[PDB]
Enzyme design. Sequence first.
Site, PDB file in Angstrom:
ATOM      1  N   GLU A   1       1.033  -1.222  -0.057  1.00  0.00           N
ATOM      2  CA  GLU A   1       0.050  -0.059   0.027  1.00  0.00           C
ATOM      3  C   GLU A   1       0.877   1.176  -0.008  1.00  0.00           C
ATOM      4  OE1 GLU A   1      -2.846   0.219  -0.795  1.00  0.00           O
ATOM      5  OE2 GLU A   1      -3.895  -1.758  -0.240  1.00  0.00           O
TER       6      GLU A   1
ATOM      7  N   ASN B   1      -7.698   8.328  -5.685  1.00  0.00           N
ATOM      8  CA  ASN B   1      -8.504   7.379  -6.226  1.00  0.00           C
ATOM      9  C   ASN B   1      -9.073   7.887  -7.521  1.00  0.00           C
ATOM     10  OD1 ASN B   1      -7.892   5.392  -4.419  1.00  0.00           O
ATOM     11  ND2 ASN B   1      -8.991   6.285  -2.942  1.00  0.00           N
TER      12      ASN B   1
ATOM     13  N   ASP C   1     -12.492   7.901  -8.222  1.00  0.00           N
ATOM     14  CA  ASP C   1     -13.770   8.299  -7.758  1.00  0.00           C
ATOM     15  C   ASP C   1     -13.470   9.859  -6.906  1.00  0.00           C
ATOM     16  OD1 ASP C   1     -12.724   7.681  -5.289  1.00  0.00           O
ATOM     17  OD2 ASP C   1     -14.300   6.582  -4.625  1.00  0.00           O
TER      18      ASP C   1
ATOM     19  N   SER D   1     -11.914  10.477  -4.303  1.00  0.00           N
ATOM     20  CA  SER D   1     -11.658  10.192  -2.547  1.00  0.00           C
ATOM     21  C   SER D   1     -10.043  10.014  -2.665  1.00  0.00           C
ATOM     22  CB  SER D   1     -12.270   8.827  -2.147  1.00  0.00           C
ATOM     23  OG  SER D   1     -11.625   7.645  -3.026  1.00  0.00           O
TER      24      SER D   1
ATOM     25  N   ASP E   1      -6.341   8.091  -0.799  1.00  0.00           N
ATOM     26  CA  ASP E   1      -5.919   7.117   0.529  1.00  0.00           C
ATOM     27  C   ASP E   1      -4.687   7.536   1.068  1.00  0.00           C
ATOM     28  OD1 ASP E   1      -7.752   5.193  -0.690  1.00  0.00           O
ATOM     29  OD2 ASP E   1      -6.309   4.063  -1.733  1.00  0.00           O
TER      30      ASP E   1
ATOM     31  N   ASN F   1      -9.043   5.261   2.865  1.00  0.00           N
ATOM     32  CA  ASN F   1      -9.662   6.004   2.021  1.00  0.00           C
ATOM     33  C   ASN F   1     -10.532   7.051   2.659  1.00  0.00           C
ATOM     34  OD1 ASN F   1     -10.571   6.982  -0.511  1.00  0.00           O
ATOM     35  ND2 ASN F   1     -11.858   5.237  -0.982  1.00  0.00           N
TER      36      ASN F   1
ATOM     37  N   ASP G   1     -15.372  -4.785   8.986  1.00  0.00           N
ATOM     38  CA  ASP G   1     -16.493  -4.127   8.371  1.00  0.00           C
ATOM     39  C   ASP G   1     -17.232  -5.422   7.460  1.00  0.00           C
ATOM     40  OD1 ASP G   1     -18.159  -1.894   7.371  1.00  0.00           O
ATOM     41  OD2 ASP G   1     -17.343  -2.283   5.309  1.00  0.00           O
TER      42      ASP G   1
END
Length: 129
Positions: A35, A46, A48, A50, A52, A59, A101
Site C-alpha cells: 500500500e 482514487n 472516484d 477520494s 488514500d 480512504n 466491516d
Amino acid sequence: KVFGRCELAAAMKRHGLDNYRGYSLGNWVCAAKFESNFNTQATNRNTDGSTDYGILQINSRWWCNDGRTPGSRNLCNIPCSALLSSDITASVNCAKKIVSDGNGMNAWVAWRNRCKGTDVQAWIRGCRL
Ligand SMILES: [Cl-]
Ligand SMILES: [Cl-]
Ligand SMILES: [Cl-]
Ligand SMILES: [Cl-]
Ligand SMILES: [Cl-]
Ligand SMILES: [Cl-]
C-alpha cells in the site's frame, strides 16, 4: 516516517494487530509494504476523487475526513491527516474498524492481489518480536 520492516512489525504488534480478526502480523506488514512501501506520508488519489492516506492507504470515501470527498463518510472520526503521522496509532485503530466491516482484509485490494494466500510470514522473518 519510512518504517523499517521489523520496526513496523513491532509497532503493529504492540498496537494489537497481530491476529486481529484472525489476520497474522505478516498479513498486515505485507499490506503496508504494497500500500505505502512503509511510508506514513503516502497519499494517492482514487479515480472516484477520494484519497488514500498513510501506511495502510485508508480512504476518505468512508473512513476519514479530508474535506474534499463528496457525500463521503468519516467512520474512524479522524482527519485524514492523522493517518500520515509518524505514530501509527490512528492508522491502526482505523484499520481495526475497516477489517471488522465484513470482507476482512479484502477491503485492501493490494492485500487481496499481492498478499492473500502467499507466504506472508516471510514479512516478519528475522524480526525480534
Ligand atoms: Cl505471519
Ligand atoms: Cl480504505
Ligand atoms: Cl469531504
Ligand atoms: Cl476533520
Ligand atoms: Cl508508532
Ligand atoms: Cl476474515
